[PDB]
Ligand binder design. Structure first.
Ligand SMILES: [Cu+2]
Ligand SMILES: [Cu+2]
Ligand SMILES: [Cu+2]
Ligand SMILES: [Cu+2]
Ligand SMILES: [Cu+2]
Ligand SMILES: [Cu+2]
Lengths: 337, 337, 337
């Protein structure tokens, strides 16, 4: 499109929504290409990540770990205002894996405390994609401090299966998975630090072991379990976007499947089908579409079950509706022999 | 199908055999849906997993690690009678990744020692699938004590390539790969215990390192080597099902290929072809079809070669037949320069 | 077919070049099947892998880590003369994942110092494939000492996308990724040894932790940076072949994508498209095709960002040409809030 064309496109501001929920959007694009505008303030803040009071100095886009899902359509532009307040201690930036050029945007968005920047890019490829902070020389420390999220660039005609038939979800959830590396003293007690930088050398030591101390969804052990379970009903179609900016994961819905899974995250790559456990490499997002058929509790886990049930990578779904005895039935309930 | 329709279907009782062998079955289904009946008794027992006498308190479906492969066809019902004898010490259950509802069956099959249960589920999706025990609060401990196996839900038509041409094996094997986490004392010797619960806390400590002490096929170092090799002949078509319920693996046939690999394990996802090394994420099963072209010894490994050749994840195939010098030949045998 | 027929085929003697470059070849085969001849001399040699001066006794095909890329076309024959000079200490051999029979060639090419051998195999499957040394009882030690490389078996008609459209690259690089396991003294400084075998025991104890101390491209931290950065231009089509003979990797071009990615490395498996981060399991090679659209610096990394930026797995590209503000622009450069 020529210059004048780009400048005349509609601009639209969107209010973000914290994970695992997602801001207002339409599956099939509304109108032609537009510039979708978002604002995020970076917050450096201590968070508690487990039920032992373990602390991390999180580096949080929009104040959450993960950062929020932004949704646009292919060939829209994403225009982000990124703000680094003067109460923060570090420079930050942003790298969108959906974008082309300048290290994903990281070369154009280095903001010290007290600065802001506005980056625009054309979302030329459809898929879910990671975004993360990447300051030169300190890239993994920011990412493993929680400074990452995802976007979704929907096809203009919405999602389709591998034969081109529409796939239209009723609900979407975004599960960001975070590996944390929390230092411990010689008694095995997690350490606490006054300011983010005080932890840098001890944290890189743990990072070099390649073994996280915690692997969590939505920023903390248990953040999406119990009273915080996600919800659905029998018959509803749910899209589950999952990202992991630094380390591999292998999602699984305990009691369900991924009926269609873009395991690479990219919508022009046909989805796998009927999956039990899919694989999302570190540095990527994936998305799974499932129609719920049975009510009750499900878990949603990274299926290294030690990561899920010892280190924190487990969520719940609570599903309403009527039980299907064709699909499963207890012929003889547990009883004495 | 209605409850009465299911009650009228034919029943077939299968006798399971121990991995890496597979029970008798037909690739193409005979006739219409059936209720395929299986029984497994759970055995808690010490197993020795290496040549140094290292022990695991195994929790073994049908007394083996992995548990046996169960074979059905799409839209059959799998009816399992699961028995937990009074000689065991723990509650157990079963979660079938092929099933829909109640945590794969785990919510309906919780059996204390001295109980049994009967679960039926409809095998609605074709593929190879993990099953495993998953008692609330104790899930990865049971799995990494060997309490896992797989099933195969064949298409009613049998297997096909990505162009719907039939693929018919002459032979099938089931390789269950197991990560074990064995505690060591201050001198580096593996510890022994006299009841499963006595090893729990020390085991969990090793599990949280994410670093197995052993990675084995069929429950031990060397289980599928030497005179317990898998066997085949030149011209024979072989399907190798491989599962890993907790940790990723990357199978490779040394000297061969995966001609067709359903690396996700799901038969409605078209297979990869001409594979050197495929990838099966923790929590899944995959399957590889190969036609042997050369005789001699092959190795079948997890191609993290430290996991294969230091930790235990290596099997052999012995193949009969005539050498093909067109495919390969020693032009000059090793000799002085 | 027969010996008369194979004697009649043309021979082509190729001179290998050092990675990341690739010897001259034709993407579409010039004429009928040929016997493509290569020679490699194995060198046991001390190499320095980081700016601290850390050393590995490398075991290097052609003197480099990785070994060089050999390029043939499907149904050519690859005929390798492999020489183990008398100045080396160990027996070595070669196992081509591209080849069929005798453990990939391993069984036929065991040469002591002062010996040579010539192996010929038919390259029946198109793709990129790992090769590596594999002496029985010492397999992972040789591979993780750098004794591995890759070959490319091009379709005779050159590369195509999943739908039959030709994909012709303008240039090709070969990135070999190497996990090294270097012992450390009680100060945590890397140890040095006199001969390869002096480090064996201490190296095996690091290998069994499954945690490399360094993960590098082209044999050292920073090897593909600075005057050794890869290069391209806006509009240029680049194929990046990447291998890892022992351990998984997840390549990512920072600021770009993989437009077409044969993540399994096999050209009869249609490529994934629009990739952010692809996944190549240990024991495999993959290849990604990308048309550069923006000038400037890029990094090409294993996107476990601790592996990339702490352990060494980061290369650079320098790209010339004109910035595209439609793809990306800084609407407001970093500036005061
Ligand atoms: Cu940051
Ligand atoms: Cu990134
Ligand atoms: Cu159990
Ligand atoms: Cu499971
Ligand atoms: Cu060697
Ligand atoms: Cu190999």
């Amino acid at each position: 499109a020529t210059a004048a064309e780009i400048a005349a496109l509609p601009r639209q501001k969107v209010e973000l929504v914290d994970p695992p929920f997602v801001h207002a959007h339409s599956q099939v694009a509304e109108g032609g290409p537009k510039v979708v505008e978002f604002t995020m303030v970076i917050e450096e803040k201590k968070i508690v990540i487990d039920d032992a009071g373990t602390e991390v100095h999180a580096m949080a886009f929009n104040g959450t770990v993960p950062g929020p899902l932004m949704v646009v359509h292919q060939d829209d532009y994403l225009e982000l205002t990124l703000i680094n307040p003067e109460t923060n201690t570090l420079m930050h930036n942003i790298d969108f894996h959906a974008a082309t050029g300048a290290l994903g945007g990281g070369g154009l968005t280095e903001i010290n405390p007290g600065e802001k920047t506005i980056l625009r890019f054309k979302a030329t490829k459809p898929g879910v994609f990671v975004y993360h902070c990447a300051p030169p020389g300190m890239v993994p420390w920011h990412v493993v401090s929680g400074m990452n999220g995802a976007i979704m660039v929907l096809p203009r005609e919405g999602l389709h299966d591998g034969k081109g038939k529409a796939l239209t979800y009723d609900k979407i959830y975004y599960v960001g998975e975070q590996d944390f590396y929390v230092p411990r003293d010689e008694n095995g007690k997690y350490k606490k630090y006054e300011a983010p930088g005080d932890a840098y050398e001890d944290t890189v030591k743990v990072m070099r072991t390649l073994t996280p101390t915690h692997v969590v969804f939505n920023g903390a052990v248990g953040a999406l379990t119990g009273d915080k379970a996600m919800t659905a009903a029998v018959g509803e179609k749910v899209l589950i976007v999952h990202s992991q900016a630094n380390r591999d994961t292998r999602p699984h819905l305990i009691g369900g499947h991924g009926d269609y899974v873009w395991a690479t995250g990219k919508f022009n790559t046909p989805p796998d089908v009927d999956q039990e456990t899919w694989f999302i490499p570190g540095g990527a997002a994936g998305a799974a579409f499932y129609t719920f058929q049975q009510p009750g509790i499900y878990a949603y886990v990274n299926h290294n079950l030690i990561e899920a049930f010892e280190l924190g990578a487990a969520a719940h779904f609570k599903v309403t509706g009527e039980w299907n005895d064709d699909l499963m039935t207890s012929v003889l309930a547990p009883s004495g022999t």
